[PDB]
Symmetry: C2
Subunit: 301 residues, 2 copies
């Protein structure tokens, strides 16, 4: 039938985006209260990025080397500090548009919205997943460093990602808002390998439930299986192993559709082995894994 | 490789969404200056919708039957008026959050962002195309009547769509902001057929250019063709005919990639006839038609 990825409304985040320029390098910053968060690599020349000593580089910089703009306004940097891979630029003006917010570190396979920004100006909003190997796919953040990923729960913006770099493979890597990289990556222009990526099994199951809910059910069979038997097949097709926590997470969708989680696992098992025979599910010719069980519940209920 | 659909930042639209309740029916309204725009079918009972005389129904209603809420605020309806299929509720308070805006009527095959809203509260943002048959696919606006589609150019929000209804097939139908339906549809609960849908040829070509730009070029062949010869094949696979205006529209992408528009048409011709042989283009197993040439230019340049 049809099922679209949905991003959170970006309004609350838009009012926090600023421009941070240092030398010939301009990237995006996040302005929350009297602090502007941005990738520490803003201080690096192209040469510096090859093997930066950030401690030593940061020391040479002065406040007045950091040009922070919010629209047409110029915010004066009062003090600069480094927390892991993120720079914290203290300013004398609290952002009046600061929303209720938390910093959160998300798990692999979870989803969030990214407000893609160029030089402090919002350009667009994307929905994406953190891959099991802690990268983001889609070639949508190229040179848009400092753009942030988030989720909105009630009135609160939970910031979970800040874009730092493209790996040589083109995939995106970044940090949480405390500047800790997702995955084994470092903010240096060197060869770095992402792990083997795997398909997010729980998400694919969620999406199949979505398909049933939307009347697209051709793939449903009258088999069931055990987690153990299913996971043998999963490993073969580079699917993340399915846990009891995952099964527990899928309960509401199982209850809504009257399809036991392990029965849905049996239908996936058959799709993996036989393919889709030139057929589509929710208008897609492949199995989609960037919708969480929560995403499906929110959109389908 | 990878290429994600991007919605416009929704902030400017978020501040315009209101709740309009009439009887047991609650839907979304657009609050611009001292006017609230919403589907006229808000005044209809479930029974009324089967065959409404809107003129007669509107007459029975009074201002005080229209409950208009902006967050926790209650806006008093000063006067109510009907322009085609949209109700215009005059209020005594101008929206202080009114952005620079235009009302525009878009062409079939064009794209826009939809701020999906439930009862005046923004829930999410989607990117979509107006199908050649003047419907919207994706089952994302169900019961979210009054949600609006838009584009943002510079500082200006160009409103182009207001959601009214799902056709019995489940696809979405709606109007421009002057209340003129897109396509042959009416705001009545009766059987209505959408035209045969066709694939948006110019958009598919745009997306192939996108694929080349992102290093995914396996489908490129050393053939060319004429518009006439191509369009013979297109008609066979229910593709929109390609015009010189379309070719002219694709010029910048042709210039960026060094691939003549008619040469790209020849590669599409081959994809249509032979399929994709279990291969993907930009991570998709089918030919995507919801990215305009403009969308591709904005995202890839």
């Amino acid at each position: 039938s049809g099922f679209r990825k949905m991003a959170f409304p970006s309004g609350k985040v838009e009012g926090c985006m600023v421009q941070v320029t240092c030398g010939t390098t301009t990237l995006n910053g996040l302005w929350l209260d009297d602090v502007v968060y941005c990738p520490r690599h803003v201080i690096c020349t192209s040469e510096d990025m090859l093997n930066p000593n950030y401690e030593d580089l940061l020391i040479r910089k002065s406040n007045h080397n950091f040009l922070v703009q919010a629209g047409n306004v110029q915010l004066r940097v009062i003090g600069h500090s480094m927390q892991n891979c993120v720079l914290k630029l203290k300013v004398d003006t609290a952002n009046p548009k600061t929303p209720k917010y938390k910093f959160v570190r998300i798990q692999p396979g979870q989803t969030f919205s990214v407000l893609a920004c160029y030089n402090g100006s919002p350009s667009g909003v994307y929905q994406c997943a953190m891959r099991p190997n802690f990268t983001i796919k889609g070639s949508f953040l190229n040179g848009l460093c400092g753009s942030v990923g988030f989720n909105i729960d009630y009135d609160c913006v939970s910031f979970c990602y800040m874009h730092h770099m493209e790996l040589p493979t083109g995939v995106h890597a970044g940090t949480d808002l405390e500047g800790n990289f997702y995955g084994p990556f470092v903010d240096r222009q060197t060869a770095q390998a992402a792990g083997t990526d795997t398909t997010i099994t729980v998400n694919v199951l969620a999406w199949l439930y979505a398909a049933v809910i939307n009347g697209d059910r051709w793939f449903l069979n009258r088999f069931t299986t055990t987690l153990n038997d299913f996971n043998l097949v999963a490993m073969k097709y580079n699917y993340e192993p399915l846990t009891q926590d995952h099964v527990d997470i899928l309960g509401p969708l199982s209850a809504q559709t009257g399809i036991a989680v392990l029965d849905m696992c049996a239908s996936l098992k058959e799709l993996l082995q036989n393919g889709m025979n030139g057929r589509t599910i929710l208008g897609s010719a492949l199995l989609e894994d960037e919708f969480t069980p929560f995403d499906v519940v929110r959109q389908c209920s």
